[PDB]
Design a protein around this nucleic acid. Structure first.
Ligand SMILES: [Zn+2]
Ligand SMILES: [Zn+2]
Ligand SMILES: [Zn+2]
Lengths: 102, 233, 104, 96, 78, 78, 96, 103, 95
DNA sequence: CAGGATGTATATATCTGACACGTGCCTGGAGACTAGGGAGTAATCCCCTTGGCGGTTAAAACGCGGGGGACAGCGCGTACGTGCGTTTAAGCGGTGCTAGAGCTGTCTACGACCAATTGAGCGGCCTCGGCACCGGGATTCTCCA
DNA sequence: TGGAGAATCCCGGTGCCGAGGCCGCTCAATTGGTCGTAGACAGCTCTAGCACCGCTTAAACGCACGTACGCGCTGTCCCCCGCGTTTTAACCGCCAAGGGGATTACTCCCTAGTCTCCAGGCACGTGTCAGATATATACATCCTG
């Protein structure tokens, strides 16, 4: 008999499918609890035994995700400018340089 | 080419079955709702295809098909073709060693819709039941392809013209998964230039459970004598 | 009510109180709260209208943050006014670069 | 016993929504977003009117200073219609 | 160490919302570094507001005002 | 009129040399004139708005400085 | 017949104009540009000399920063010259 | 004078008057103008000291805008404090990218 | 003498310059830049203290608001030395 | 070879969590009146803007040769996308405990406020030297034999 | 690589106007009383944040495979640069009206503060519905005799 495995999707097709799915939805893309642990670890270096409201961690996660999404949008535009379709660390560093954060 | 040069029927032909063209599966998916895109048509009477077959329409670029009637282009959307059957022209040629080939009937432009592999989609215990009943019955031709990893397709019971193919280590066509009506389906497409007369034979990439396959009669230096899959199951 | 005298929905009185006790100037003119309430109600009506149209075009009857995000980012002028604000749980506009699509 | 009287623009945004589209509702989080937006636009216009009064050595925010702030803040047709609405409002208010 | 808790698939998803099609393997360390700098600045300003107000909990309003100070005002929390 | 061509090719080339540019495409000059027209249009618009509010008929240096201040490009020395 | 190579004069001009501090646009043409732009808002406007100098300073500084970032984009794209799409990219990243 | 009592050169009286008449709060604490004058004196002293150093490094005893520019841009924290600031007649740092240098 | 009094920070910036640099002068344009800079930083700090007082439902700008605004606006080592100078000045002034 | 118990897909009456509307209450808004000071308006002055003219000459325009860098194709290899199977924390709910936010009460220190005073600081004018500019030689960099 | 050549740098000499200081003046800064509300502080309440735990399962992870895309090389060609020659208009100094910014004089209406009163807005129950869920139910699977 035998299982007959056909050809998979070409590289990029599932990627574009994810592009459309995540640009159409609104749920958070970062895991809430690991991010909360990251927030408490970063806050540790200023005041010991700091407490956070859940809405504060949620506002930080929203702000963080919006900032990274906008940075990757700018990175994608500079990447596509340079005749590539693959972003590189240099691209993000260029984005931050032009934005004035460096 | 013209290597597979009296065409045969479907039911010098192969074994009999029932010609199907619709969804007559076992139970069922894909769950991906394709929403109505804002594609500009350039279509009133068919001067140009609305969701064009090789232009930049967002639905066709990701192997997604519009349903008929709900996309903004209406019915002239060429990315509706699994629901409207814009198939190519093949026929059934009898070959003494390759068996039955889909000979091309018109000279085919590369990178276009050629045909669709439709049949019965089933799960794994009923699938191994089909395997056991068929190799206890004694068939020598096996159509136990996998749509997804879970489900499987079979066309010898109620199939269509996509049965008459084989394995070639140099493929001319290929098969790729598409989605239509929230249903995952399969389509065979060309990649190279296709001339009327030669059989359209691709890479099966079978992981056969048996030990003795028929040899790959492609006769090329790229053929290892047998087919070549992924795992030795 | 002072709001009904100007034919506005937004509270002229509350705006007047916020202006006096919001530490913006020593004195606040009489026409300033009426004018400010008119501008606030107009901008609120414009963005709620664009959001309502976006929600209705997506076959929903409840305005959600996503529809506000579309309302802002799809109207050039409001986009200019609100270019540096983040709307909570709003996502981004569907925008796929042409170059990412397959070739001929 | 109730907790604390906290004010918001909730009911006014809802009245405006019912004035422009009677069969349309709004989520609570969206009402919060609208409240933050109204407070933001308010703070910007009041800050600019404050700077205008300060730069010209005046201690009164009148409708003229708000009008100039509006012309500075809204880009184009938004400013033109805002000035139209404000003129209507102030006129009808002082003439009744 | 918890900066690696913002896992590589999540970073990929973040890029996916931004329209990125292919991602180099070296991106993830740069992205975690950028995230660390941004969160460090916003959290530092939030902690400065809490220390001023003599409160021990970082409140939502503190985060909103901290973000607004850096020109990234956030709607939907007050 | 067509006085915007008063900003000539070598002056734009000078600005570019000060910016670190080494070679200049021929279309850069028209693109830079258009960008500068947009920028100056916005700044002069804000300046004239300040001047008309102050009941003055001359755009003063303070109006231009405050206008630049509104756009986050503050200027010192006027 | 002694000619410099295409590019060393560019570097010497870069060192020269980065070393000096003076307005690089011609004063009177820029003043005509300013007055022309100002005509479309209010007729018969007067300008203080210091206002025109402040405008020229801000104009030169903004163009210098824009060309510096455009140059960084050019170098990023494995080139040494600037193209219009580099300026459009720079302004897009900045946020216009 | 309250300035000499607090050991500051900046006028705490003037700062206090600007605070009262500047529409910042209804009441202004007595320690606030002293603290603000101290912070202004520190920032002024740092920028002036760096501009002076740069001026000696250009064989000039009179500080001109170019020296203030060099002073601002060579201090990373002042550059961060003044990232949206433009100094008139300041010019640009001598920064030539590596890729343009002859090889 | 038939001219409106236009205040400045000129003489104080000059005093600070003479205290930090013995033999050094300063041009008119550089003094204008420094004066606008001092007015700018004053406006920033006072605005930040004003909004900080407003946020916490306070109506008074005390040393605390100025201290927090200085820590918010000045990056790193600048903030450290500025808060040191502020505390020093208030300590001397209350005595 | 045989039905019964069992597993599975299907349509379903229902359950939940978020939203629209009615209820009591309280505090802030509205109305009324008065005082004082900011501002509105007329009037005058005089600074500095606008306009003009003429001579200088430096920069801009323009033309042309040429080189080197942009761009496109080709080819190549490796790294990243996709997918499968394995595992693990994420998430959810459920439970418990107490820190601290939030509100109140009382009191007091601290700043608003006002009048008198006086010197710090500002405008005007006056002086001399740092610098802007120029010329001459010296070094430094570049490029072609 | 070194000599020629152009560009720039350094180093003194002259002129000049602007930095820096003094003088007279005025109004804002300082001091001393006088008071009234903001806030510091202790206490109490009650929400909500943190901590733990079990369970389920969706996503992360690791490896395998393969292709397509990044990157380096090479050719072509064309466009911008270096530079010389010609032209035009910016620029600098000087002058002449005169417009309008800035100040003055004085009045007066508009807004802060206070007092009086009541209903509009907010917290909270109460009812209603998209969307998810446990449940009757038809058809195929195994299951033992
Ligand atoms: Zn389409
Ligand atoms: Zn379509
Ligand atoms: Zn073969």
């Amino acid at each position: 008999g035998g299982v007959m495995k056909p050809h998979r999707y070409r590289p990029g097709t599932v990627a574009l499918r994810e592009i459309r799915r995540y640009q159409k939805s609104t749920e958070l893309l970062i895991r809430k609890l690991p991010f909360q642990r990251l927030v408490r670890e970063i806050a540790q270096d200023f005041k010991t035994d700091l407490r956070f409201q859940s809405s504060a961690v949620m506002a930080l996660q929203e702000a963080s995700e919006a900032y990274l999404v906008a940075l990757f949008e700018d990175t994608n535009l500079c990447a596509i400018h340079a005749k590539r379709v693959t972003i590189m660390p240099k691209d993000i560093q260029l984005a931050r340089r032009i934005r004035g954060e460096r | 080419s013209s290597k597979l040069p009296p065409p045969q029927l479907f039911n010098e032909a192969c074994r009999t079955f029932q010609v199907i063209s619709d969804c007559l599966y076992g139970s069922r998916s894909s769950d991906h709702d394709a929403l109505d895109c804002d594609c500009a048509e350039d279509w009133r009477d068919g001067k140009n295809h609305a969701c064009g077959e090789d232009s930049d329409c967002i639905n066709r670029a990701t192997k997604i098909e519009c349903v008929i009637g709900d996309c903004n282009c209406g019915e002239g959307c060429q990315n509706q073709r699994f629901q409207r059957k814009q198939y190519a022209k093949v026929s059934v040629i009898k070959t003494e060693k390759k068996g039955y080939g889909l000979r091309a009937d018109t000279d085919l432009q590369p990178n276009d819709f050629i045909y669709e592999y439709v049949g019965e989609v089933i799960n794994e215990p009923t699938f191994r039941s089909r395997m056991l009943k068929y190799d206890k019955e004694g068939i020598k031709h096996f159509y136990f392809m996998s749509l997804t990893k879970n489900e499987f397709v079979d066309a010898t019971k109620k199939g269509n013209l996509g049965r008459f193919c084989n394995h070639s280590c140099n493929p001319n066509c290929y098969v790729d998964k598409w989605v239509v009506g929230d249903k995952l389906r399969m389509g065979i497409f060309a990649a190279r230039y296709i001339k009327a007369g030669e059989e359209l034979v691709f890479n099966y990439n079978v992981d056969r459970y048996g030990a003795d396959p028929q040899p790959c009669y492609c006769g090329e230096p790229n053929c290892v004598g047998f087919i070549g899959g992924k795992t030795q199951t | 009510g002072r709001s009904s005298r100007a034919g506005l929905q937004f509270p002229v009185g509350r705006v007047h109180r916020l202006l006096r006790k919001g530490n913006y100037a020593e004195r606040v003119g009489a026409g300033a709260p009426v004018y400010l309430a008119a501008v606030l109600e107009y901008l609120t009506a414009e963005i709620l209208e664009l959001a309502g149209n976006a929600a209705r075009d997506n076959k929903k009857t409840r305005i959600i943050p996503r529809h506000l995000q579309l309302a802002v980012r799809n109207d050039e002028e409001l986009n200019k006014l609100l270019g540096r604000v983040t709307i909570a749980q709003g996502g981004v506009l569907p925008n796929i670069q042409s170059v990412l699509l397959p070739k001929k | 016993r109730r907790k604390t009287r906290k004010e918001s623009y909730a009911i006014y945004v809802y009245k405006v929504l019912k004035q422009v589209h009677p069969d349309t509702g709004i989520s609570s989080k969206a009402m919060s977003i609208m409240n933050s937006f109204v407070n933001d636009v308010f703070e910007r216009i009041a800050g600019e009117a404050s700077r205008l009064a300060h730069y010209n050595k005046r201690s009164t925010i009148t409708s003229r200073e708000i009008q100039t702030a509006v012309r500075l803040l809204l880009p184009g047709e938004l400013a033109k219609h805002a000035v139209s609405e404000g003129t209507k409002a102030v006129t009808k208010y002082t003439s009744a | 160490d918890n900066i690696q808790g913002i896992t590589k698939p999540a970073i990929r998803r973040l890029a996916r919302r931004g329209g990125v099609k292919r991602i180099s393997g070296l991106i993830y360390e740069e992205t975690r570094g950028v995230l660390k700098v941004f969160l460090e600045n916003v959290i530092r300003d939030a902690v400065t507001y809490t220390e001023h107000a003599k409160r021990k909990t970082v409140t939502a309003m503190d985060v909103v005002y901290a973000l607004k100070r850096q020109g990234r005002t956030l709607y939907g929390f007050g």
